[PDB]
Amino acid sequence: MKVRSSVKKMCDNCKVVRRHGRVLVICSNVKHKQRQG
């Protein structure tokens, strides 16, 4: 879980999911779990 203030796509499996006022990204690849919070 890498906390980056700049979350952007890195492949073709990354899906941005807006949660409870937070930026998260789902992906089959567990190394692509970026999150601003």
Next chain:
Amino acid sequence: MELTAKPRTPKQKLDESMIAAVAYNKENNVSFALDRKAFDRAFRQQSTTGLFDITVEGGETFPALVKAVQMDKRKRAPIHVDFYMVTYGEPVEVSVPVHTTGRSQGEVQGGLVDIVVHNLQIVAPGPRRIPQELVVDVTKMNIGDHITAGDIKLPEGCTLAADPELTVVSVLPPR
């Protein structure tokens, strides 16, 4: 481009999608005011080498040719445009751009094809027959080959303006 009112105060122009334009030739010099979108759709095609039908509010179709545009800074949307009512025989000198067709024999070898001058202004364009483009052979070029305006075919009835020995296109070396 259906032209409507044409005052002098830009009060009812900035708010709405209108752009301030003018037109002249040698007689009348009445200022106009054309639509933003209409122009942004038409100038994209005919550019500066093609006239368009300009009907003023009332029934006045006056043929003209775009001369100088004064686009705005900080923005891509123009703010002023100058028009020239084409005469019939010898109007004004028109600027004709230079395109390129066919793959060169120097681009393959490793070098790159570089147009030194995009736009090229000529003399006496000739009404009703204005060159909207310009096709210049590029394949005959290799590495370090310079092609001037003495090498560009004339669109028949058109004479050059710039110096005969000016480099229009040149194939630069790699790196």
Next chain:
Amino acid sequence: KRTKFRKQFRGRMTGDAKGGDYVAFGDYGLIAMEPAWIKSNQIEACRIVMSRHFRRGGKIYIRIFPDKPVTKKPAETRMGKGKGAVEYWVSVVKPGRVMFEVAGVTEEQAKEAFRLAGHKLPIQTKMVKREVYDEA
């Protein structure tokens, strides 16, 4: 990068853009939306990254040479006059000013070079296309 022989010192002031077209010497370009100062080392960085991205070409045009000497604080104090004769040079940049232009590469191959350089500039910028034909 740096000038070859000038006077020495200078002043400071920003007014609206003046002499920056849209399409000059090439197909694609990059413009400022914000008025600032461009250190020479910033330029160098840009130029260089652009080089990395474009193995062969050398069709990178940079017409924003730095002609502004800026002074600097020796150590401390304040007793004494004009300080820091040589620190760095700058290239005033006003919105509308064309800093960088390139040609030959595709569409995708310009967004990249530009996008990168852009992460080295102290102000936002944008990429444009051909459509303007003022003076030639």
Next chain:
Amino acid sequence: MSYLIRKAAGIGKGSSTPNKAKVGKLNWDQVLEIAKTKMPDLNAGSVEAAANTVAGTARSMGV
């Protein structure tokens, strides 16, 4: 089929830059024996349909 070309045209190696400096040039006669020995490895049509296949490879090899 590159081996056969490196034998027929007598090519020691090839060319790193086929866009600048090439290797050599052969003839169609040396192509007929290629589409005659490697028949099962080609499902082309007839004559030309198998003559334009090999010519392809050669084109990017430096011939």
Next chain:
RNA sequence: GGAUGUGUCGUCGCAUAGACAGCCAGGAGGUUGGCUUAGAAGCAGCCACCCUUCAAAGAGUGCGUAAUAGCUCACUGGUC
């Protein structure tokens, strides 16, 4: 700096002549391209991006191994 947060104008292209996402199915023969390297065959970099069959399959996107494999996408058909 970053993002399918929303409201409101616009630039490009795709239409039942049946998209797009999803699902089922197929996926090259030249070829193990040439070259450089102990080796790198879509996927380090130099180069190209040519041909055929076909309702059709770009010597090609990501992940991988010491190279191989495999798992897919571009594209085609069908069911709503």
Next chain:
RNA sequence: UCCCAAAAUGUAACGGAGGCGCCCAAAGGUCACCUCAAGACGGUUGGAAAUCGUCUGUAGAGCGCAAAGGUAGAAGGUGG
């Protein structure tokens, strides 16, 4: 003397550059008279400049020194 000085004048700082503490019996007075720098072409101790000549040339020179202003109808250069 410039610049700062923000278009009358004026205006500060341990702000930014550079000079003077002289010189000329002529470099004064007056009266006459001459026209520069530079480049090109062509010439011998030259072969960069210069000496000569023919062109071009609002002066891109000169004015004892620093600078600005100003000067070709002279405040440039000589003679009685």
